[PDB]
Design a protein around this ligand. Structure first.
Ligand code: FAD
Ligand code: FAD
Ligand code: CL
Ligand code: CL
Ligand code: CL
Ligand code: CL
Ligand code: MG
Ligand code: MG
Lengths: 437, 437
């Protein structure tokens, strides 16, 4: 079938590649509105911190390379501006010429993702981060202005990674956030180490703080404070890239995302939507979910490839929402329903704080693991772990347990890999099970 | 009931403590033939290495402390020499006075463990490592003789830990083993990094090599080589401590272990066996299993405590044989049936080697993950992982998958915690699922 993919990055290039693995005959074209395909979105903060030095590390492919290797055509600086879904074509603006044309399809895959929000100030010193053009502009500006003091606005996990990288590069960031709900995928009492790590490094922060006005480099804040900053990086949320879809028959929710079934189909035949634009449901509970992270983009890209060109019985089973961030010496990881969704259930909480590994073994640190379960059926609803060591291991185990709607009591039965450097004969996970009675 | 426990360490002291948590009235007496109770067995190689130097980590209690805390009587230097099951007593030898006496019981719990094998040479410089008296004797002999050159015999995970520790202490060990089958819980072609780590550090080794004769410090070998060593530590396997059980009605297998049901009962009413002495079955396949490791001793201790004084519906579900060892910069872990047991199934193998975390992100190291699955039902039989980073995490997640009867194909659905320090958007585990078929 002739395949048109919109977006050439985490969902779209992956989906196209997966289809080509299954099907060597079909014509596949991807349209990408910006300069680069297949950049490593998650590497971008580390490119700013110069922790990833070789900036080609964050760019897997050029169009010429993709055609050479996979016989897939990728057109950059080509923005899909309308879907003419009844005629099965898309309208495409060639952004270099400002001429538009239609591209026909038998199957359309929409992976256009999300764009950064802006606070909307008229300011040359403010930047957002979503692609490699942005990473380049930020790096350029730091060098051209010898940036030292940088205001980081927003306290979500990417803004935090940007802050850390700026600090390691030698700059002096201050963090602000409009509320006290920092790193909101993690339980709010368990985010305290973020604020400790900032305090330990004397990196200033102010929560429930916002920009009121910008006059050149002089920033006035809601608190009444006035400070000079050489550069501002705004991490103030994202919005779905669906304006080009509104005129078509595809159903959007009230926020502009595309609800999909378990085959990533939209309500319109022959159109699929994957990645951050798609909304689905949890695997382990009957609630809607949106989980705009890399794993879901790559997983949906594979399921859609199977749907189109492989085994059409392969269908998504829903999300668990496994997520994680590093901030300085700590890891913060959670999975399951979000904090604010716990109230849809009758639930209890169990938690342990114990050494990541045997206490006498050096380099130990306290790991805090918390699990919420549903009192009607003992099923695990959510887990969270924070520590210098071992958080990602416990959370990945519990994601595997929730995939199987395992109960909290069955955690006593989990058979850990135990030697002194790694865990305890009764691992933290087992202790949750023992403590749940 | 009146409770007698034989062995006061990983299974026996734990079990007695767990009973006391549930039942504050029963009399509970533990007999231990050696000097110490509740030593940390897995800490021992690290004690020898001066990695663990605080005594309070090597030894958790004395009998007087245990009594004061838990009103459990522990008689060290008391060796049970017969089990008089028809009269419900044990015959005990007080090794201090060399007098024996009968002790009556209502419930008897056998946790005698295993003893180290010896090569049988008449040698003042040769030591085995099983307990804290052993550990003290080795540390004292190094100090009394200004030991520099130590021969480590055997290549099991305990000999390998002892080798690493003697090296970190500043001594000069050489490793030998009778064959090339080193570290045999791991797939024989995934142990090369043990030899690479020995070479990198210029620590000599010889395989297919044995001690042929000893004359003082002059050791003559099977190869014909003749060398001088200051000390020898022999790690040439263990044998079950069951010769004292053989006159009783308790059924032993031909290898001298005690088979038990899922309540850890023996064939004799009111007698339980737990820890290294006990044999049971795999959880995920219908085959016998013995897994002489700390998790099993601790989980059996809990189940027995429930049987006697708590919820007697709690039963064992079988072993998976999760196991792990550190050797210098590498981790070696595996779970499921042993390599020799794979031939009892029609199976296939799938593997992947990939960075532990994102390709672009620094500090990376390749992680080799291998999965065997049953072709009759696509169930996972065995998994094994070796790498500097992330092998513990992948093997615990697969331990949890095997607990939940996951097929290899379902591993594409595992939702990993992804950010660049931790994994990839399709983790190694997901790659095994995609590469299967
Ligand atoms: C800085 C940063 C760090 C992140 N870190 C992590 C992390 O550690 N872990 C994690 O799991 N996720 C992380 N993410 C999120 C992850 O990158 C996304 O979930 C993933 O990119 C979703 O894939 P997608 O295909 O939907 O969107 P994208 O990868 O963003 O690709 C969408 C593409 O579509 C193009 N497009 C949009 N509209 C059109 C149109 N009309 N015509 C042509 N092209 C169009 C866009 O230009 C864009 O290139 C991070 C994201 C960022 C920005
Ligand atoms: C050096 C070393 C390192 C290890 N490292 C690991 C590791 O990293 N991970 C892991 O999981 N496991 C490790 N193990 C194994 C783990 O310690 C054993 O699986 C666990 O100790 C088994 O508990 P048990 O109660 O059966 O035996 P033990 O803990 O050995 O206790 C048995 C006790 O019974 C006593 N006893 C025997 N017979 C009698 C008798 N007739 N009368 C009175 N008392 C008697 C013995 O003297 C002994 O003290 C290690 C073991 C050693 C020796
Ligand atoms: Cl990435
Ligand atoms: Cl149309
Ligand atoms: Cl231990
Ligand atoms: Cl008798
Ligand atoms: Mg139209
Ligand atoms: Mg259909």
């Amino acid at each position: 079938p002739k395949i048109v993919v919109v977006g050439a990055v985490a969902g779209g290039a992956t989906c196209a590649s997966q289809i080509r693995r299954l099907d060597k005959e079909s014509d596949i074209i991807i349209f990408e509105k910006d300069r680069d395909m297949s950049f490593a979105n998650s590497a971008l903060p580390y490119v700013i911190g110069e922790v990833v030095e070789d900036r080609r590390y964050a760019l897997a492919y050029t169009p010429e390379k993709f055609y050479d290797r996979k016989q897939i055509t990728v057109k950059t600086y080509h923005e899909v501006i309308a879907i003419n879904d009844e005629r099965q074509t898309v309208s495409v603006l060639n952004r270099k010429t400002n001429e538009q044309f239609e591209e026909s399809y038998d199957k359309l895959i929409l992976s256009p993702g999300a764009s950064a929000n802006s606070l909307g100030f008229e300011s040359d010193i403010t930047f957002t981060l979503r692609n490699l053009e942005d990473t380049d502009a930020i790096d350029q500006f730091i060098k051209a202005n010898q940036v030292d003091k940088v205001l980081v606005v927003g306290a979500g996990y990417v803004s935090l990674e940007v802050l850390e990288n700026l600090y390691e590069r030698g700059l002096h960031p201050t963090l602000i956030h409009r509320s006290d709900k920092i790193n909101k995928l993690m339980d709010a009492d368990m985010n305290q180490p973020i604020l400790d790590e900032l305090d330990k490094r004397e990196i200033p922060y102010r929560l429930n703080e916002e920009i009121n006005a910008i006059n050149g480099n002089e920033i006035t804040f809601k608190s009444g404070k006035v400070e000079h900053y050489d550069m501002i990086i705004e991490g103030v949320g994202t919005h779905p890239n669906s304006k080009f879809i509104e005129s078509s028959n595809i159903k959007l929710d009230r926020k502009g995302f595309i609800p999909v079934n378990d085959k990533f189909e939209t309500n319109v035949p022959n159109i699929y939507a994957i990645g951050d634009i798609a909304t689905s449901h949890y695997r382990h509970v009957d609630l809607p979910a949106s989980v705009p992270l890399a794993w879901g983009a790559h997983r949906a890209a594979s399921i859609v490839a199977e749907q189109i060109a492989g085994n059409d019985t392969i269908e998504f089973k829903g999300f668990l929402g496994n997520n994680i961030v590093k901030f300085f010496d700590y890891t913060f990881a959670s999975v399951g329903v979000k904090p604010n969704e716990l109230k849809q259930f009758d639930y209890k909480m169990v938690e342990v704080t114990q050494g990541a590994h045997a206490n006498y073994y050096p380099g130990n640190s306290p790991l805090h693991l918390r699990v919420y379960y549903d009192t009607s059926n003992r099923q695990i609803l959510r887990a969270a772990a924070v520590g210098k060591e071992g958080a990602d291991k416990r959370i990945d185990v519990l994601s595997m347990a929730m995939m199987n709607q395992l109960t909290v009591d069955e955690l006593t039965e989990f058979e850990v890999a135990y030697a002194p450097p790694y865990s305890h004969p009764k691992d933290l996970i087992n202790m949750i099970g023992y403590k749940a009675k």
